[PDB]
mmCIF file of C-alpha atoms and ligand atoms in Angstrom:
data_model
loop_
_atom_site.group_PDB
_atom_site.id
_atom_site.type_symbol
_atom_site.label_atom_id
_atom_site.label_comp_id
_atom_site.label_asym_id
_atom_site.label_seq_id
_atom_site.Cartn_x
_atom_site.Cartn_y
_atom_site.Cartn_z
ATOM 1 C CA UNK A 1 -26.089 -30.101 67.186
ATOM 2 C CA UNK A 2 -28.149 -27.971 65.231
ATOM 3 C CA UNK A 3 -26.659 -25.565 62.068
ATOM 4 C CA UNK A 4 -27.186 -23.203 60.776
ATOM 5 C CA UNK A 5 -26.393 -22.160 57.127
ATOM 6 C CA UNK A 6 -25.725 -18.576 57.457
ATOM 7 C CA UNK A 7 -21.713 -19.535 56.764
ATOM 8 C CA UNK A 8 -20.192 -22.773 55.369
ATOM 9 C CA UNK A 9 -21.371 -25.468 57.716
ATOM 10 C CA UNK A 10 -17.779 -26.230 57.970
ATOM 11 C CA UNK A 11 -16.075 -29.285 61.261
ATOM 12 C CA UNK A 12 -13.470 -30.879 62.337
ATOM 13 C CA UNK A 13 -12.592 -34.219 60.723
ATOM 14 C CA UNK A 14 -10.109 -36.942 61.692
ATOM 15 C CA UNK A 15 -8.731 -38.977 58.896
ATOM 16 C CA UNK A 16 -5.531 -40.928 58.106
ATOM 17 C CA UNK A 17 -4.797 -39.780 61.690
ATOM 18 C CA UNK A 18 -4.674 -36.008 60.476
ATOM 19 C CA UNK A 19 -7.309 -33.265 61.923
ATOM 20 C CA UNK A 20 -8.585 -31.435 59.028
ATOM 21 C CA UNK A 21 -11.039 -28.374 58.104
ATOM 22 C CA UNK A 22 -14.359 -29.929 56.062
ATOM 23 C CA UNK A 23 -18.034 -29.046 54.865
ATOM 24 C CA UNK A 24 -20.988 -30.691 55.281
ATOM 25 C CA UNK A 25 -21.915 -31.318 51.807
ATOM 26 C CA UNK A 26 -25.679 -32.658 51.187
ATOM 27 C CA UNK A 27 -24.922 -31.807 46.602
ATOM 28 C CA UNK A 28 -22.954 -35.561 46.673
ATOM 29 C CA UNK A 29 -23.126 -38.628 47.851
ATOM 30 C CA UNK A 30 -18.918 -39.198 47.815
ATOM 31 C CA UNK A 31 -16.736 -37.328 50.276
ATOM 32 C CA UNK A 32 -14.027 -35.742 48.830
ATOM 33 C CA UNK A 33 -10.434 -34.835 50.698
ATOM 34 C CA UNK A 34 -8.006 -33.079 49.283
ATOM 35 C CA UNK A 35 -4.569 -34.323 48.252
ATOM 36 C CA UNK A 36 -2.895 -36.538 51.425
ATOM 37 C CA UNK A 37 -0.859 -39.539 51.393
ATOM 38 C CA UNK A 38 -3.482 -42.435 52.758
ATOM 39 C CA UNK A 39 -1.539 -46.011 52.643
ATOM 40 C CA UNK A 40 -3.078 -48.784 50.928
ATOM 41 C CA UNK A 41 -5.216 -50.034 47.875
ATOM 42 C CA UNK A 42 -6.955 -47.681 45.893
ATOM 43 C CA UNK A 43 -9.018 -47.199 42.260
ATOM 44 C CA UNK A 44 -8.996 -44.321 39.692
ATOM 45 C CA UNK A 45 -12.610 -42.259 39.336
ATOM 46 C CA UNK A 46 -13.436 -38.842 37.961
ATOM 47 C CA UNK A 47 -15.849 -37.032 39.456
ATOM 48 C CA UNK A 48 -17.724 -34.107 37.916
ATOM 49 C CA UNK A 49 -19.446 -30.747 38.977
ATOM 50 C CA UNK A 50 -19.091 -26.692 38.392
ATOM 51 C CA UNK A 51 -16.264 -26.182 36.348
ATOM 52 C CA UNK A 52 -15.974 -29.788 34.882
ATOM 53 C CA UNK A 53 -13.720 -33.003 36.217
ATOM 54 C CA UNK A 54 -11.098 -33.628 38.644
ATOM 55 C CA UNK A 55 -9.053 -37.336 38.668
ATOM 56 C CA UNK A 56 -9.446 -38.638 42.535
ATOM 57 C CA UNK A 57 -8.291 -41.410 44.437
ATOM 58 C CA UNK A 58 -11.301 -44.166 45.709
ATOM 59 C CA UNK A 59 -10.295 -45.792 48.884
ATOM 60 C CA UNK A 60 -12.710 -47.557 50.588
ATOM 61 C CA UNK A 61 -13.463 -48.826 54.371
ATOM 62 C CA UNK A 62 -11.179 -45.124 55.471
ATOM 63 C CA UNK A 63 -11.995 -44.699 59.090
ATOM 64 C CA UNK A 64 -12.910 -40.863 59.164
ATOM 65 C CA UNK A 65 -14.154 -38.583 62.468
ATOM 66 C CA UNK A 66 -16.452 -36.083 61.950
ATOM 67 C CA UNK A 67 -17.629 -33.768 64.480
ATOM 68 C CA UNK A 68 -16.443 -36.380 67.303
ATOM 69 C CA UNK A 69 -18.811 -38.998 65.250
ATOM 70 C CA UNK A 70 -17.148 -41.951 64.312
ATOM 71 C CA UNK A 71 -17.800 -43.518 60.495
ATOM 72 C CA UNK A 72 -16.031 -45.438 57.807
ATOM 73 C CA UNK A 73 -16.732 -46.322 54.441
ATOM 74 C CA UNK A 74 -15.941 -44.794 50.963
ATOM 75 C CA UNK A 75 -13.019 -41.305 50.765
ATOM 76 C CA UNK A 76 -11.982 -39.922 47.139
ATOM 77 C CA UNK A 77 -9.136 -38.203 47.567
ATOM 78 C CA UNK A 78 -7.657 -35.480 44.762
ATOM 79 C CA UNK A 79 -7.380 -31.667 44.404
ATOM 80 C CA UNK A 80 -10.257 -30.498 45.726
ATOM 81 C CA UNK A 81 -10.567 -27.039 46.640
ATOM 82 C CA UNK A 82 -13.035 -27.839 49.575
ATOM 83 C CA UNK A 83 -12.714 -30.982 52.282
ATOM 84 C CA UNK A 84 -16.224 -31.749 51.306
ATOM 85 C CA UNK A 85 -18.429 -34.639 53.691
ATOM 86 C CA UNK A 86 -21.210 -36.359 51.351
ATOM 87 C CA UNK A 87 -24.097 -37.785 52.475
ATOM 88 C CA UNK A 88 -22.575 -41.642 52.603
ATOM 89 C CA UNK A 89 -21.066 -39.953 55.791
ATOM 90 C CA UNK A 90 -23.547 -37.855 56.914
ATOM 91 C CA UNK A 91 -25.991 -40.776 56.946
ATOM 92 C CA UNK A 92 -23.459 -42.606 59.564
ATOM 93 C CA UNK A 93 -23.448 -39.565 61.513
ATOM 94 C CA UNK A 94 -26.870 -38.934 61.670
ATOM 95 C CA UNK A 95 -27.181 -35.616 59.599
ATOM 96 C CA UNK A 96 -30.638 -35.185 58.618
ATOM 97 C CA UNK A 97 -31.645 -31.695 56.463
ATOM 98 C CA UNK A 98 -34.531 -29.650 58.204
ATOM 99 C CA UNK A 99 -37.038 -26.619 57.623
ATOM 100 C CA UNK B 1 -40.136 -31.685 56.967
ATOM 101 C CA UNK B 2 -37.041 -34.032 58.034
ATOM 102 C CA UNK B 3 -35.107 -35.151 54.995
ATOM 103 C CA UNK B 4 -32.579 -38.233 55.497
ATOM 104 C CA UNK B 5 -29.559 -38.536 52.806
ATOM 105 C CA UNK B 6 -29.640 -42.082 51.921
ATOM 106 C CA UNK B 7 -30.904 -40.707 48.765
ATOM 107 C CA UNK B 8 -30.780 -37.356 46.877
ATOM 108 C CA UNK B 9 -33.039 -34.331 48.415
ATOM 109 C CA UNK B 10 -34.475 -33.833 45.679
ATOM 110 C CA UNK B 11 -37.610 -30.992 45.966
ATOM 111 C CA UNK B 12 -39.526 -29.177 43.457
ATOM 112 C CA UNK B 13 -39.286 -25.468 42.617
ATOM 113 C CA UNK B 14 -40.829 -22.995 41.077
ATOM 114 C CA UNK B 15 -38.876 -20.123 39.096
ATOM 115 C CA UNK B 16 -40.422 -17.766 36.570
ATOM 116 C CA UNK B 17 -43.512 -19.366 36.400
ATOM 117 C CA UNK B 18 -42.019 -23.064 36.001
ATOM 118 C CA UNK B 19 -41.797 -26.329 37.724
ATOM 119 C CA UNK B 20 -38.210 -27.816 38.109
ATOM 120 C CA UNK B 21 -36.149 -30.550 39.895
ATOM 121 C CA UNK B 22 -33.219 -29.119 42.315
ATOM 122 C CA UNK B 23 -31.009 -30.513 44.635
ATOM 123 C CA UNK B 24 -30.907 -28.919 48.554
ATOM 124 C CA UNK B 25 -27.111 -28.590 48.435
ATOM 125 C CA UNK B 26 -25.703 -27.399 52.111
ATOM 126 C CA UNK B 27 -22.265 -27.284 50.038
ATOM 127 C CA UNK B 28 -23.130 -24.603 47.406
ATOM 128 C CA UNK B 29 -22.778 -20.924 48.826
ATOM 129 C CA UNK B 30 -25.108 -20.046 45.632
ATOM 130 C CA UNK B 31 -28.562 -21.280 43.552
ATOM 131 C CA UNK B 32 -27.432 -22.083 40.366
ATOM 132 C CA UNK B 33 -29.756 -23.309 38.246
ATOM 133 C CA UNK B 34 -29.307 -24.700 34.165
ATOM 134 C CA UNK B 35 -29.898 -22.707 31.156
ATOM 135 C CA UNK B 36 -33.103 -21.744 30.958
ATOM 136 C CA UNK B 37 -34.941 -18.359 29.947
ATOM 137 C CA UNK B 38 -36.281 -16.158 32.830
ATOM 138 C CA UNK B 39 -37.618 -12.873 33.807
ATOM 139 C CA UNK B 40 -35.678 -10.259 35.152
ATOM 140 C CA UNK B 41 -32.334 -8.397 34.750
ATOM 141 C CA UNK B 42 -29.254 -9.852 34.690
ATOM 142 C CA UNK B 43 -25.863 -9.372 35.214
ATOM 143 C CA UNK B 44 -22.503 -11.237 34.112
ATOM 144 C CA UNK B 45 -20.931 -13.264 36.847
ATOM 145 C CA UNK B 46 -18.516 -16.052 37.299
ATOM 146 C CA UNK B 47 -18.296 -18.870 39.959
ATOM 147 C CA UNK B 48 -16.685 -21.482 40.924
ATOM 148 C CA UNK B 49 -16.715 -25.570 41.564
ATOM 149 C CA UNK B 50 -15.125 -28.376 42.355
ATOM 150 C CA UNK B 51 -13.801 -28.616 38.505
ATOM 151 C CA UNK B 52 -12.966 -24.785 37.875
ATOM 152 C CA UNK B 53 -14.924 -21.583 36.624
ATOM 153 C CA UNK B 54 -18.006 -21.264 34.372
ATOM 154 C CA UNK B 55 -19.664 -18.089 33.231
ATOM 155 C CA UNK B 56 -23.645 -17.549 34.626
ATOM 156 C CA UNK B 57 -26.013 -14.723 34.215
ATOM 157 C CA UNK B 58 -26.677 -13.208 37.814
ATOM 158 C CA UNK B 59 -30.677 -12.739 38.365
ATOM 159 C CA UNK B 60 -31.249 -11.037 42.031
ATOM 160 C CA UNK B 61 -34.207 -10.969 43.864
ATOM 161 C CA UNK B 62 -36.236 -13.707 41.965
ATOM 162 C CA UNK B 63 -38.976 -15.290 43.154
ATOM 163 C CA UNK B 64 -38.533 -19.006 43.519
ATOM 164 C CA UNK B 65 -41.041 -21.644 45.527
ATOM 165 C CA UNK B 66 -38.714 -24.314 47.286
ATOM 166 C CA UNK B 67 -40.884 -27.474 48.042
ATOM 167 C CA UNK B 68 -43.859 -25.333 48.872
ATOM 168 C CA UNK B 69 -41.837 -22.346 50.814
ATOM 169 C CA UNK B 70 -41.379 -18.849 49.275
ATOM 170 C CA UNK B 71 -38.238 -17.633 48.748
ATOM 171 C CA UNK B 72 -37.034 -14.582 46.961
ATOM 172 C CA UNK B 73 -33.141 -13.992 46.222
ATOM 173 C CA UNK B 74 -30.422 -14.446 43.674
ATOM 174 C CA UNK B 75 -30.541 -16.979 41.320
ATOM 175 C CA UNK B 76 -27.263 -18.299 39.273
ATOM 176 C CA UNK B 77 -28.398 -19.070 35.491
ATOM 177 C CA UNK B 78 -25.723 -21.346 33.669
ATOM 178 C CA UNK B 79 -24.120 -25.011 32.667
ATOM 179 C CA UNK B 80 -24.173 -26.638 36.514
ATOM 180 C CA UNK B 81 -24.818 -30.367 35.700
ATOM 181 C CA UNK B 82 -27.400 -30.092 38.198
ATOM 182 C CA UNK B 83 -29.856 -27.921 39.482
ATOM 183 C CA UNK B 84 -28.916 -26.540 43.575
ATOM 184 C CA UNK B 85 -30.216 -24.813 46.098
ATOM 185 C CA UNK B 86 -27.758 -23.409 47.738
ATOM 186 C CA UNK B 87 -27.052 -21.417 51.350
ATOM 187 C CA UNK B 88 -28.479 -18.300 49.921
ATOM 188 C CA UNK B 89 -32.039 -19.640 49.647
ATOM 189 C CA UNK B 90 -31.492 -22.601 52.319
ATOM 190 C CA UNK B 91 -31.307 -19.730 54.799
ATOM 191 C CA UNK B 92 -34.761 -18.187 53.744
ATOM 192 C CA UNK B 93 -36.582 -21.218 54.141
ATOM 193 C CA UNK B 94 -34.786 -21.647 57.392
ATOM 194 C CA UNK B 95 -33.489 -25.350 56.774
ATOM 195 C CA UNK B 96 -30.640 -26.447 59.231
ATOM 196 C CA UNK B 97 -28.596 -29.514 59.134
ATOM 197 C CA UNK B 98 -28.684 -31.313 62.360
ATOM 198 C CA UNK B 99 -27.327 -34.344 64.159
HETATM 199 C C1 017 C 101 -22.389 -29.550 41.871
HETATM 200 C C2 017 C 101 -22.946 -30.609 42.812
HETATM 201 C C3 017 C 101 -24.051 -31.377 42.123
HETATM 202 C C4 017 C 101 -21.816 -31.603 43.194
HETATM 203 N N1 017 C 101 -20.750 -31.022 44.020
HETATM 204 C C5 017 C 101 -20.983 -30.720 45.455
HETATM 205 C C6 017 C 101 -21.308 -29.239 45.650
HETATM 206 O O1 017 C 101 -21.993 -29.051 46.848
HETATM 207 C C7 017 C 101 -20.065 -28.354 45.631
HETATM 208 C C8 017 C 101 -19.132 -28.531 46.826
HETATM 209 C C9 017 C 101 -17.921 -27.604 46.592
HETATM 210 C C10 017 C 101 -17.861 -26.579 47.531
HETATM 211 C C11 017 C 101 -16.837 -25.626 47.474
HETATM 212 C C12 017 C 101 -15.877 -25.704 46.475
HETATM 213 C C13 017 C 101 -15.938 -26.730 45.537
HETATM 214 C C14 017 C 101 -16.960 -27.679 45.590
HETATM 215 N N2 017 C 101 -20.525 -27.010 45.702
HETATM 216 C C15 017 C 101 -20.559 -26.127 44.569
HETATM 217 O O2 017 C 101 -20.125 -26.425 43.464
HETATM 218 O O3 017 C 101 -21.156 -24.870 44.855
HETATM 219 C C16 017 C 101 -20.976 -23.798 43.988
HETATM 220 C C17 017 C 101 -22.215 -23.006 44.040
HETATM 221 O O4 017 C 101 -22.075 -22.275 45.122
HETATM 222 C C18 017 C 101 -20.532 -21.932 45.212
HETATM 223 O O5 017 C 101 -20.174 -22.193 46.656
HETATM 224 C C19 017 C 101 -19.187 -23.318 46.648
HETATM 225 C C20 017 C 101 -18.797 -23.427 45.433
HETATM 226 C C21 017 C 101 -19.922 -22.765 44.496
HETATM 227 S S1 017 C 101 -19.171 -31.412 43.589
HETATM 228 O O6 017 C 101 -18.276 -30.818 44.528
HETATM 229 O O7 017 C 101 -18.927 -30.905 42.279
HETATM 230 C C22 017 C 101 -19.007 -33.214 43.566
HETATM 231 C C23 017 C 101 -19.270 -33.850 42.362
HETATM 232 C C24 017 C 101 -19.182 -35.231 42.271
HETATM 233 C C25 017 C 101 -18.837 -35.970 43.389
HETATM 234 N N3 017 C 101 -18.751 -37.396 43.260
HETATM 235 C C26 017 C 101 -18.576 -35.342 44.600
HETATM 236 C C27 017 C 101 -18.661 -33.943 44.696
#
């Protein structure tokens, strides 16, 4: 698919077995879900941007659908305002930014 | 060109006169750009990120070069820890994300 960027280049997402509302996100590397119940081991991180920090969850190898494109690999989860996809995803996907 | 997002897309710019770094951010509705003193009026404004609010002076209709293409819109002016380009100005250079 091409998108545009008129509106919030906002998919579908499957993760944790939950379908979810998230945007495409080229500003970070991380993805960034917000606040879910995912089982198993994770790390504490703070990650920084407008507005200052938030305290997220790391979990890593979280299997995660996006667009009907499978990928795993590295989820933060916390209070996020956005579902945001980083590039670590979009690279799996195949995203590429073009003008 | 084609940008892949293994790393950072990173361009230069070219606001009031001067050569900057800025990140092509498909997550940011808005430019915001740090402190820095340019021509033009500007009005009080407030957005907001993934860590809250932050005050920024509102510059419209500036004249900004993104990797060699010629925008001209509004231009956020305040503490973001980095500089974006964001869907306002992505638009006028007509980048899309694809996959
Ligand atoms: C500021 C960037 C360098 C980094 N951010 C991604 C960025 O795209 C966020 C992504 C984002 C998107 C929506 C809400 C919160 C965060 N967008 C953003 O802050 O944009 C602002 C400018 O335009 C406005 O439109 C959206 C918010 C405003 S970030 O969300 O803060 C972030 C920071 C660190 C990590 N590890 C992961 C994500």
């Amino acid at each position: 698919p091409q998108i545009t960027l008129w509106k919030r280049p906002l998919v579908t997402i499957k993760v944790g077995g939950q379908l979810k509302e998230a945007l495409l996100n080229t500003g970070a590397d991380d993805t960034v879900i917000e606040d879910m119940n995912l089982p198993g081991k994770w790390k504490p991180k703070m990650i920084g941007g407008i507005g200052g920090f938030i305290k997220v969850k790391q979990y890593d190898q979280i299997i995660i659908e996006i667009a009907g494109h499978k990928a795993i690999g590295t989820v933060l989860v916390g209070p996020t305002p956005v579902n945001i996809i980083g590039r670590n995803l979009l690279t799996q996907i195949g995203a590429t930014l073009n003008f």
